[PDB]
Amino acid sequence: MISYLKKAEKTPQTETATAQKVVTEMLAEIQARGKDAVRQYAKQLDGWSGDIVLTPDQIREQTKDVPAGVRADIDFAIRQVTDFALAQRESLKEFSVELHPGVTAGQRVLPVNVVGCYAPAGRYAHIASAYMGVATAKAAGVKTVVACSSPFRGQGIHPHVLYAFQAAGADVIMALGGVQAIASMAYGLFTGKPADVVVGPGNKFVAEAKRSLYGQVGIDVFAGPSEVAVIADETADPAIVASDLVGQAEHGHESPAWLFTTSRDLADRVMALVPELIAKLPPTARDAATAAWRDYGEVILCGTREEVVEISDRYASEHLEVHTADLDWWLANLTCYGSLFLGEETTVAFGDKTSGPNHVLPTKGAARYSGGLSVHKFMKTLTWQQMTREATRQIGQVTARISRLEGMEAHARTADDRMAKYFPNASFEMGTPVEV
Amino acid sequence: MISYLKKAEKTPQTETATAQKVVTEMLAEIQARGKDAVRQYAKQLDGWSGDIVLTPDQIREQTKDVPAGVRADIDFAIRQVTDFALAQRESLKEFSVELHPGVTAGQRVLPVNVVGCYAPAGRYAHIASAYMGVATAKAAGVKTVVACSSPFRGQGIHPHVLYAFQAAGADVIMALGGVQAIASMAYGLFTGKPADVVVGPGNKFVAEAKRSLYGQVGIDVFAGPSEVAVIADETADPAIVASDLVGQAEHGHESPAWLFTTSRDLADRVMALVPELIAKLPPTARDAATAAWRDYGEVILCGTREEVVEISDRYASEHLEVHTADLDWWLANLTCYGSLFLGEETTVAFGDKTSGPNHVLPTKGAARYSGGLSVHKFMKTLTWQQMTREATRQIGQVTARISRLEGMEAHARTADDRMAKYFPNASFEMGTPVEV
Ligand SMILES: NC(=O)C1=CN([C@@H]2O[C@H](COP(=O)(O)OP(=O)(O)OC[C@H]3O[C@@H](n4cnc5c(N)ncnc54)[C@H](O)[C@@H]3O)[C@@H](O)[C@H]2O)C=CC1
Ligand SMILES: NC(=O)C1=CN([C@@H]2O[C@H](COP(=O)(O)OP(=O)(O)OC[C@H]3O[C@@H](n4cnc5c(N)ncnc54)[C@H](O)[C@@H]3O)[C@@H](O)[C@H]2O)C=CC1
Ligand SMILES: O=C(O)[C@@H](O)CS(=O)(=O)O
Ligand SMILES: O=C(O)[C@@H](O)CS(=O)(=O)O
Ligand SMILES: [Zn+2]
Ligand SMILES: [Zn+2]
């Protein structure tokens, strides 16, 4: 008993090829021609001819008129993000353990050296994105943080994005957008400090560029056009459900809004209401959401909660709201989503700006295998070990034998050599020497 | 000043273009043609015309002659890997916290649904790799584990590789190698079970295939041709240092072996001994190690411990052995490596086969941003949140104001709507409505 009351023509997969073609071309050009290729893209794409690296004096000049009340809101949001980041940092521990007697092994948890953070600016200026990356990197104890945001409307970095970067602790700020920003941070163009990890959200081109540069750099997650899903039962309020879908639909023409419900009445009311709310939006938002709802919006009626879980996990939405009775059950049973909003009171926009948990989140089904940007994306979990000579009697003979079973004679000789050195009178079966 | 007593012509970067050209072509063919392309590659690259998925009966038949002693060694190794993996699992906790009053936020730690594991077989048959992936996935509580290894030496999967997969708990086993194996696991070809995460080591083509498919799937880490670095002071034994370098140089022509030392006498003796040890290897190993040492081997003399740390962190070796006095200091000060071997007694081959910590590890500098395969690579760290209505007074007004500063009116309306529903008599500043 599963019925599409609204089916989308397009999905997050639809625009893959378009993004990949552009990114392949631009990365090739930037690899070949470095800073010059980037300055050319900045000019042709973003109308930008000025300096790319902002000086401290420029940062101060460009934020000097940012009012106290704006700064207070941004500062409060930075605190909430920092508070939760520090809680997440405490959840991953170092340890050591004894395995075979005399074998000590452990886990070190160490921050990366350099992070590059992207904050988008195109349709809107992503003030909150600016602190989501930088504040988290600082909470992780990352020593160098480089931050980029696109020149905005043929001017420079939006001043509130700039304030957010500075207030959150960015060490270097560049007026640089899109693929060329992501590439510049990966290769250390302009700063001479190649990033270890590049993070942050953006359009399909930005997200693909990061996906492509994985390997050269670590990343947080594939964080492309915003997605919202709501699970609702008959207790939900259609006006609020509809509002919440429209809230993320304004992000752009490619943003999916998904409703999974056990109530046809709720589905019906929401489908009537969403167009009405969209029609009351201002121009830019109405442009985005009209196309997004039409092309990517879906409404799925389900017979049981179990069916809702199955569909929701398959969709693996960036953001998942749950407006139902018995919220404990939903927290226990849902397994694929970026960020979960339990109950009507919280909502995606709160998470976007100031709840505390990061908003930089998996899209296009990446929630099947990753959560969002967090301190965990900046910590390396490395292993170490140490042995007594006694431990090597067992460990070394097993190693020699398995190595020789595999055909790895030089491996086995490293065990032979220790056995002969440490225990010259011992006689073990170290495996028949490899002859080929 | 840092002196290269042996400089390499080649580095892990040298063969990037070669690997990328092949992988681009094969992944295009498999995307377009599916199983047909995979069957074609299995035949053309690996000489294989047989069925690809093994039945339970084939698994039994192909392992029925594996001797008790071989099974006992493999079983011991699986236990060590499992023991350490369970300890790692305990190191990442779920939690919840109060942020702003009435805001509850938490972290859920959930295993992925399907993992695909690759165990290489080409120059050698990677028995240990077979349990490194599968046993770790099972320790993480992954419910479906798909495992591939290449047809080897005119037969199917090497029988000891197959025993390792079975004993470690693989649900599905495929006789399937290389790029076609990685792609089949990513797309769920032959099983109808697309992986959420694909893991495991291989040659440059395997590693590039995984790196390229990132996004479609999650991965552990870029785990390509094996690397070994040794840090040594004057207390080290050159015979053991040389043996350890040669141990990993046998992996293939592209395996780098690096010595970082403060002792000129040690460097000199190791440089004399390494060729002598290589000359005494059987043919496959001698073929690999001669080329590897010549082309990729490096010996670097440093004045101070601090210089050694700086160079070692820059190289970011998959494996790092430390044959020095004062091992505590090295543990405290080194920061970029895959897996650390403190003291002479343990050694890379032990970690490869049976110490416990995973051997599937970052190469080509990936240790700057990730540790190895571990249970952590199978867990998703997701966030959830829940609010009282009261919490939304602060959270909602900050959200509305910031949203409107960014130009996101629909976002702000979701806050407005809650404020009107929950607190109709409140009169907070919710920001100037966006008009454009
Ligand atoms: N997944 C997540 O956690 C989040 C996702 N987002 C998403 O970020 C996106 C922001 O998109 P935008 O407003 O476009 O800002 P953006 O900053 O991502 O993109 C602007 C940059 O892209 C370049 N660009 C645009 N079209 C291009 C083309 N055809 N070829 C090459 N370069 C091109 C521009 O010249 C500029 O440099 C939205 O879709 C939003 O939903 C926002 C926040 C978080
Ligand atoms: N980073 C790590 O943790 C580890 C790395 N390794 C590395 O794994 C590697 C194993 O390499 P192999 O013996 O080659 O086994 P493999 O299993 O990686 O490769 C064999 C497969 O690759 C295919 N292949 C080989 N050359 C090809 C080409 N030119 N075009 C397309 N397909 C091609 C073969 O047909 C076959 O399917 C070694 O370099 C070893 O050092 C081993 C264990 C762990
Ligand atoms: O997809 C996201 O995380 C966005 O909703 C965040 S923001 O609205 O751009 O702040
Ligand atoms: O790079 C590696 O981890 C290898 O040394 C592991 S094995 O020798 O192939 O087991
Ligand atoms: Zn949003
Ligand atoms: Zn090895």
JSON list of C-alpha atoms in Angstrom, two decimals, chain A residues 52-212:
[
{"chain": "A", "resi": 52, "resn": "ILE", "atom": "CA", "xyz": [41.43, 37.32, -4.44]},
{"chain": "A", "resi": 53, "resn": "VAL", "atom": "CA", "xyz": [43.07, 37.09, -0.99]},
{"chain": "A", "resi": 54, "resn": "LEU", "atom": "CA", "xyz": [41.53, 39.70, 1.35]},
{"chain": "A", "resi": 55, "resn": "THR", "atom": "CA", "xyz": [43.89, 41.50, 3.71]},
{"chain": "A", "resi": 56, "resn": "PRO", "atom": "CA", "xyz": [42.97, 42.05, 7.40]},
{"chain": "A", "resi": 57, "resn": "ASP", "atom": "CA", "xyz": [42.53, 45.74, 6.59]},
{"chain": "A", "resi": 58, "resn": "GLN", "atom": "CA", "xyz": [40.11, 44.86, 3.77]},
{"chain": "A", "resi": 59, "resn": "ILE", "atom": "CA", "xyz": [38.18, 42.47, 6.02]},
{"chain": "A", "resi": 60, "resn": "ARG", "atom": "CA", "xyz": [37.84, 45.22, 8.65]},
{"chain": "A", "resi": 61, "resn": "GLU", "atom": "CA", "xyz": [36.89, 47.87, 6.09]},
{"chain": "A", "resi": 62, "resn": "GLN", "atom": "CA", "xyz": [34.26, 45.64, 4.47]},
{"chain": "A", "resi": 63, "resn": "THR", "atom": "CA", "xyz": [32.59, 44.70, 7.81]},
{"chain": "A", "resi": 64, "resn": "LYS", "atom": "CA", "xyz": [32.92, 48.08, 9.59]},
{"chain": "A", "resi": 65, "resn": "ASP", "atom": "CA", "xyz": [29.24, 48.98, 9.17]},
{"chain": "A", "resi": 66, "resn": "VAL", "atom": "CA", "xyz": [27.84, 45.58, 10.17]},
{"chain": "A", "resi": 67, "resn": "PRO", "atom": "CA", "xyz": [25.41, 46.49, 13.01]},
{"chain": "A", "resi": 68, "resn": "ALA", "atom": "CA", "xyz": [25.63, 45.26, 16.59]},
{"chain": "A", "resi": 69, "resn": "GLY", "atom": "CA", "xyz": [22.31, 43.42, 16.31]},
{"chain": "A", "resi": 70, "resn": "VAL", "atom": "CA", "xyz": [23.44, 41.43, 13.27]},
{"chain": "A", "resi": 71, "resn": "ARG", "atom": "CA", "xyz": [26.73, 40.58, 14.95]},
{"chain": "A", "resi": 72, "resn": "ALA", "atom": "CA", "xyz": [24.83, 39.45, 18.08]},
{"chain": "A", "resi": 73, "resn": "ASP", "atom": "CA", "xyz": [22.67, 37.02, 16.09]},
{"chain": "A", "resi": 74, "resn": "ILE", "atom": "CA", "xyz": [25.63, 35.58, 14.19]},
{"chain": "A", "resi": 75, "resn": "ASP", "atom": "CA", "xyz": [27.64, 35.31, 17.41]},
{"chain": "A", "resi": 76, "resn": "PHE", "atom": "CA", "xyz": [24.81, 33.43, 19.15]},
{"chain": "A", "resi": 77, "resn": "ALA", "atom": "CA", "xyz": [24.59, 31.00, 16.23]},
{"chain": "A", "resi": 78, "resn": "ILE", "atom": "CA", "xyz": [28.38, 30.47, 16.27]},
{"chain": "A", "resi": 79, "resn": "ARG", "atom": "CA", "xyz": [28.12, 29.60, 19.97]},
{"chain": "A", "resi": 80, "resn": "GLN", "atom": "CA", "xyz": [25.41, 26.98, 19.37]},
{"chain": "A", "resi": 81, "resn": "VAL", "atom": "CA", "xyz": [27.38, 25.36, 16.54]},
{"chain": "A", "resi": 82, "resn": "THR", "atom": "CA", "xyz": [30.55, 25.41, 18.67]},
{"chain": "A", "resi": 83, "resn": "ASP", "atom": "CA", "xyz": [28.77, 23.95, 21.72]},
{"chain": "A", "resi": 84, "resn": "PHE", "atom": "CA", "xyz": [27.42, 21.00, 19.75]},
{"chain": "A", "resi": 85, "resn": "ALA", "atom": "CA", "xyz": [30.76, 20.52, 17.90]},
{"chain": "A", "resi": 86, "resn": "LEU", "atom": "CA", "xyz": [32.58, 20.24, 21.23]},
{"chain": "A", "resi": 87, "resn": "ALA", "atom": "CA", "xyz": [30.03, 17.67, 22.40]},
{"chain": "A", "resi": 88, "resn": "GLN", "atom": "CA", "xyz": [30.65, 15.66, 19.23]},
{"chain": "A", "resi": 89, "resn": "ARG", "atom": "CA", "xyz": [34.40, 15.94, 19.73]},
{"chain": "A", "resi": 90, "resn": "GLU", "atom": "CA", "xyz": [34.05, 14.34, 23.19]},
{"chain": "A", "resi": 91, "resn": "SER", "atom": "CA", "xyz": [32.19, 11.35, 21.68]},
{"chain": "A", "resi": 92, "resn": "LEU", "atom": "CA", "xyz": [35.32, 9.98, 19.92]},
{"chain": "A", "resi": 93, "resn": "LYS", "atom": "CA", "xyz": [37.99, 8.69, 22.32]},
{"chain": "A", "resi": 94, "resn": "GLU", "atom": "CA", "xyz": [41.59, 7.59, 22.17]},
{"chain": "A", "resi": 95, "resn": "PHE", "atom": "CA", "xyz": [42.37, 4.24, 23.76]},
{"chain": "A", "resi": 96, "resn": "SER", "atom": "CA", "xyz": [44.82, 1.40, 23.96]},
{"chain": "A", "resi": 97, "resn": "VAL", "atom": "CA", "xyz": [44.18, -2.29, 24.51]},
{"chain": "A", "resi": 98, "resn": "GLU", "atom": "CA", "xyz": [46.13, -5.53, 24.91]},
{"chain": "A", "resi": 99, "resn": "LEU", "atom": "CA", "xyz": [45.38, -8.15, 22.20]},
{"chain": "A", "resi": 100, "resn": "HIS", "atom": "CA", "xyz": [47.52, -11.31, 22.13]},
{"chain": "A", "resi": 101, "resn": "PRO", "atom": "CA", "xyz": [49.58, -11.13, 25.39]},
{"chain": "A", "resi": 102, "resn": "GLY", "atom": "CA", "xyz": [52.32, -8.56, 24.98]},
{"chain": "A", "resi": 103, "resn": "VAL", "atom": "CA", "xyz": [50.63, -6.90, 21.96]},
{"chain": "A", "resi": 104, "resn": "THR", "atom": "CA", "xyz": [49.55, -3.34, 22.76]},
{"chain": "A", "resi": 105, "resn": "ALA", "atom": "CA", "xyz": [47.50, -1.49, 20.14]},
{"chain": "A", "resi": 106, "resn": "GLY", "atom": "CA", "xyz": [45.75, 1.83, 20.23]},
{"chain": "A", "resi": 107, "resn": "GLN", "atom": "CA", "xyz": [43.93, 4.64, 18.47]},
{"chain": "A", "resi": 108, "resn": "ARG", "atom": "CA", "xyz": [45.18, 8.22, 18.22]},
{"chain": "A", "resi": 109, "resn": "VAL", "atom": "CA", "xyz": [42.71, 10.94, 17.29]},
{"chain": "A", "resi": 110, "resn": "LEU", "atom": "CA", "xyz": [44.43, 13.87, 15.60]},
{"chain": "A", "resi": 111, "resn": "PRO", "atom": "CA", "xyz": [43.16, 17.00, 13.79]},
{"chain": "A", "resi": 112, "resn": "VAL", "atom": "CA", "xyz": [44.13, 17.73, 10.21]},
{"chain": "A", "resi": 113, "resn": "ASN", "atom": "CA", "xyz": [46.44, 20.68, 9.59]},
{"chain": "A", "resi": 114, "resn": "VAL", "atom": "CA", "xyz": [44.67, 22.79, 6.93]},
{"chain": "A", "resi": 115, "resn": "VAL", "atom": "CA", "xyz": [40.95, 23.01, 6.15]},
{"chain": "A", "resi": 116, "resn": "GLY", "atom": "CA", "xyz": [39.41, 24.86, 3.23]},
{"chain": "A", "resi": 117, "resn": "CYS", "atom": "CA", "xyz": [35.79, 25.98, 3.82]},
{"chain": "A", "resi": 118, "resn": "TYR", "atom": "CA", "xyz": [33.37, 27.11, 1.11]},
{"chain": "A", "resi": 119, "resn": "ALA", "atom": "CA", "xyz": [30.30, 29.25, 1.84]},
{"chain": "A", "resi": 120, "resn": "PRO", "atom": "CA", "xyz": [28.00, 29.65, -1.19]},
{"chain": "A", "resi": 121, "resn": "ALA", "atom": "CA", "xyz": [26.70, 32.91, -2.55]},
{"chain": "A", "resi": 122, "resn": "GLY", "atom": "CA", "xyz": [24.57, 33.03, -5.67]},
{"chain": "A", "resi": 123, "resn": "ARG", "atom": "CA", "xyz": [20.81, 33.09, -5.36]},
{"chain": "A", "resi": 124, "resn": "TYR", "atom": "CA", "xyz": [21.29, 33.92, -1.67]},
{"chain": "A", "resi": 125, "resn": "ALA", "atom": "CA", "xyz": [24.25, 34.82, 0.56]},
{"chain": "A", "resi": 126, "resn": "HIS", "atom": "CA", "xyz": [24.95, 31.91, 2.88]},
{"chain": "A", "resi": 127, "resn": "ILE", "atom": "CA", "xyz": [25.85, 33.60, 6.15]},
{"chain": "A", "resi": 128, "resn": "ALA", "atom": "CA", "xyz": [25.11, 30.47, 8.20]},
{"chain": "A", "resi": 129, "resn": "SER", "atom": "CA", "xyz": [27.17, 28.25, 5.86]},
{"chain": "A", "resi": 130, "resn": "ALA", "atom": "CA", "xyz": [30.11, 30.57, 6.54]},
{"chain": "A", "resi": 131, "resn": "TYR", "atom": "CA", "xyz": [30.19, 29.70, 10.26]},
{"chain": "A", "resi": 132, "resn": "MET", "atom": "CA", "xyz": [29.08, 26.04, 9.85]},
{"chain": "A", "resi": 133, "resn": "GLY", "atom": "CA", "xyz": [32.44, 25.18, 8.27]},
{"chain": "A", "resi": 134, "resn": "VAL", "atom": "CA", "xyz": [34.89, 27.52, 9.97]},
{"chain": "A", "resi": 135, "resn": "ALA", "atom": "CA", "xyz": [33.47, 27.24, 13.52]},
{"chain": "A", "resi": 136, "resn": "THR", "atom": "CA", "xyz": [33.53, 23.44, 13.28]},
{"chain": "A", "resi": 137, "resn": "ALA", "atom": "CA", "xyz": [37.14, 23.38, 12.03]},
{"chain": "A", "resi": 138, "resn": "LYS", "atom": "CA", "xyz": [38.20, 25.58, 14.95]},
{"chain": "A", "resi": 139, "resn": "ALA", "atom": "CA", "xyz": [36.24, 23.39, 17.39]},
{"chain": "A", "resi": 140, "resn": "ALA", "atom": "CA", "xyz": [38.22, 20.42, 16.04]},
{"chain": "A", "resi": 141, "resn": "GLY", "atom": "CA", "xyz": [41.51, 22.22, 16.80]},
{"chain": "A", "resi": 142, "resn": "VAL", "atom": "CA", "xyz": [42.49, 22.73, 13.15]},
{"chain": "A", "resi": 143, "resn": "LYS", "atom": "CA", "xyz": [45.37, 25.18, 13.09]},
{"chain": "A", "resi": 144, "resn": "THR", "atom": "CA", "xyz": [44.86, 26.75, 9.64]},
{"chain": "A", "resi": 145, "resn": "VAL", "atom": "CA", "xyz": [41.45, 27.53, 8.13]},
{"chain": "A", "resi": 146, "resn": "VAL", "atom": "CA", "xyz": [41.10, 29.03, 4.65]},
{"chain": "A", "resi": 147, "resn": "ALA", "atom": "CA", "xyz": [37.65, 30.29, 3.67]},
{"chain": "A", "resi": 148, "resn": "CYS", "atom": "CA", "xyz": [36.13, 31.25, 0.31]},
{"chain": "A", "resi": 149, "resn": "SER", "atom": "CA", "xyz": [32.80, 32.77, -0.71]},
{"chain": "A", "resi": 150, "resn": "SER", "atom": "CA", "xyz": [31.74, 33.88, -4.18]},
{"chain": "A", "resi": 151, "resn": "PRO", "atom": "CA", "xyz": [31.82, 37.57, -5.17]},
{"chain": "A", "resi": 152, "resn": "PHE", "atom": "CA", "xyz": [28.15, 38.38, -4.74]},
{"chain": "A", "resi": 153, "resn": "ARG", "atom": "CA", "xyz": [26.25, 40.34, -7.41]},
{"chain": "A", "resi": 154, "resn": "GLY", "atom": "CA", "xyz": [29.31, 41.73, -9.21]},
{"chain": "A", "resi": 155, "resn": "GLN", "atom": "CA", "xyz": [30.56, 43.07, -5.85]},
{"chain": "A", "resi": 156, "resn": "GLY", "atom": "CA", "xyz": [32.78, 41.27, -3.32]},
{"chain": "A", "resi": 157, "resn": "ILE", "atom": "CA", "xyz": [32.04, 38.83, -0.53]},
{"chain": "A", "resi": 158, "resn": "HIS", "atom": "CA", "xyz": [28.70, 39.60, 1.11]},
{"chain": "A", "resi": 159, "resn": "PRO", "atom": "CA", "xyz": [29.61, 41.59, 4.30]},
{"chain": "A", "resi": 160, "resn": "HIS", "atom": "CA", "xyz": [27.66, 39.35, 6.68]},
{"chain": "A", "resi": 161, "resn": "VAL", "atom": "CA", "xyz": [29.27, 36.22, 5.16]},
{"chain": "A", "resi": 162, "resn": "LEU", "atom": "CA", "xyz": [32.54, 38.00, 5.72]},
{"chain": "A", "resi": 163, "resn": "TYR", "atom": "CA", "xyz": [31.70, 38.84, 9.33]},
{"chain": "A", "resi": 164, "resn": "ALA", "atom": "CA", "xyz": [30.70, 35.22, 9.93]},
{"chain": "A", "resi": 165, "resn": "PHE", "atom": "CA", "xyz": [33.99, 33.90, 8.53]},
{"chain": "A", "resi": 166, "resn": "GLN", "atom": "CA", "xyz": [36.05, 36.35, 10.61]},
{"chain": "A", "resi": 167, "resn": "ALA", "atom": "CA", "xyz": [34.04, 35.86, 13.83]},
{"chain": "A", "resi": 168, "resn": "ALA", "atom": "CA", "xyz": [34.20, 32.05, 13.48]},
{"chain": "A", "resi": 169, "resn": "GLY", "atom": "CA", "xyz": [38.01, 32.11, 13.25]},
{"chain": "A", "resi": 170, "resn": "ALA", "atom": "CA", "xyz": [39.05, 31.99, 9.56]},
{"chain": "A", "resi": 171, "resn": "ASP", "atom": "CA", "xyz": [42.79, 32.55, 9.10]},
{"chain": "A", "resi": 172, "resn": "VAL", "atom": "CA", "xyz": [42.61, 33.44, 5.40]},
{"chain": "A", "resi": 173, "resn": "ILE", "atom": "CA", "xyz": [39.58, 34.70, 3.45]},
{"chain": "A", "resi": 174, "resn": "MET", "atom": "CA", "xyz": [39.33, 34.71, -0.35]},
{"chain": "A", "resi": 175, "resn": "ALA", "atom": "CA", "xyz": [36.77, 36.29, -2.66]},
{"chain": "A", "resi": 176, "resn": "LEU", "atom": "CA", "xyz": [36.41, 33.26, -4.88]},
{"chain": "A", "resi": 177, "resn": "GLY", "atom": "CA", "xyz": [33.37, 31.25, -5.98]},
{"chain": "A", "resi": 178, "resn": "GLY", "atom": "CA", "xyz": [32.34, 27.88, -7.33]},
{"chain": "A", "resi": 179, "resn": "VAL", "atom": "CA", "xyz": [34.55, 25.23, -8.87]},
{"chain": "A", "resi": 180, "resn": "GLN", "atom": "CA", "xyz": [37.52, 27.61, -9.03]},
{"chain": "A", "resi": 181, "resn": "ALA", "atom": "CA", "xyz": [37.26, 28.21, -5.25]},
{"chain": "A", "resi": 182, "resn": "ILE", "atom": "CA", "xyz": [37.16, 24.47, -4.45]},
{"chain": "A", "resi": 183, "resn": "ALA", "atom": "CA", "xyz": [40.13, 23.79, -6.78]},
{"chain": "A", "resi": 184, "resn": "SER", "atom": "CA", "xyz": [42.07, 26.75, -5.38]},
{"chain": "A", "resi": 185, "resn": "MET", "atom": "CA", "xyz": [41.67, 25.47, -1.84]},
{"chain": "A", "resi": 186, "resn": "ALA", "atom": "CA", "xyz": [42.59, 21.90, -2.82]},
{"chain": "A", "resi": 187, "resn": "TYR", "atom": "CA", "xyz": [45.81, 22.95, -4.57]},
{"chain": "A", "resi": 188, "resn": "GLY", "atom": "CA", "xyz": [46.72, 25.79, -2.22]},
{"chain": "A", "resi": 189, "resn": "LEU", "atom": "CA", "xyz": [46.55, 28.42, -4.98]},
{"chain": "A", "resi": 190, "resn": "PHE", "atom": "CA", "xyz": [47.07, 32.01, -3.77]},
{"chain": "A", "resi": 191, "resn": "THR", "atom": "CA", "xyz": [47.94, 30.95, -0.18]},
{"chain": "A", "resi": 192, "resn": "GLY", "atom": "CA", "xyz": [50.60, 28.29, -0.75]},
{"chain": "A", "resi": 193, "resn": "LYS", "atom": "CA", "xyz": [48.72, 26.17, 1.83]},
{"chain": "A", "resi": 194, "resn": "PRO", "atom": "CA", "xyz": [46.99, 23.18, 0.11]},
{"chain": "A", "resi": 195, "resn": "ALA", "atom": "CA", "xyz": [44.06, 21.97, 2.17]},
{"chain": "A", "resi": 196, "resn": "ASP", "atom": "CA", "xyz": [44.02, 18.57, 3.84]},
{"chain": "A", "resi": 197, "resn": "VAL", "atom": "CA", "xyz": [40.20, 18.63, 3.90]},
{"chain": "A", "resi": 198, "resn": "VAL", "atom": "CA", "xyz": [37.84, 20.79, 1.84]},
{"chain": "A", "resi": 199, "resn": "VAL", "atom": "CA", "xyz": [34.32, 21.26, 3.21]},
{"chain": "A", "resi": 200, "resn": "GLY", "atom": "CA", "xyz": [31.12, 23.17, 2.61]},
{"chain": "A", "resi": 201, "resn": "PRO", "atom": "CA", "xyz": [27.93, 23.19, 0.55]},
{"chain": "A", "resi": 202, "resn": "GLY", "atom": "CA", "xyz": [27.10, 24.57, -2.86]},
{"chain": "A", "resi": 203, "resn": "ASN", "atom": "CA", "xyz": [25.40, 24.09, -6.20]},
{"chain": "A", "resi": 204, "resn": "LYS", "atom": "CA", "xyz": [25.79, 20.96, -8.33]},
{"chain": "A", "resi": 205, "resn": "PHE", "atom": "CA", "xyz": [29.10, 22.29, -9.77]},
{"chain": "A", "resi": 206, "resn": "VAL", "atom": "CA", "xyz": [30.61, 22.99, -6.33]},
{"chain": "A", "resi": 207, "resn": "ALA", "atom": "CA", "xyz": [29.48, 19.60, -4.98]},
{"chain": "A", "resi": 208, "resn": "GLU", "atom": "CA", "xyz": [30.85, 17.74, -8.03]},
{"chain": "A", "resi": 209, "resn": "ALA", "atom": "CA", "xyz": [34.15, 19.64, -7.84]},
{"chain": "A", "resi": 210, "resn": "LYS", "atom": "CA", "xyz": [34.65, 18.48, -4.27]},
{"chain": "A", "resi": 211, "resn": "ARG", "atom": "CA", "xyz": [33.57, 14.91, -5.18]},
{"chain": "A", "resi": 212, "resn": "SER", "atom": "CA", "xyz": [36.09, 14.91, -8.03]}
]
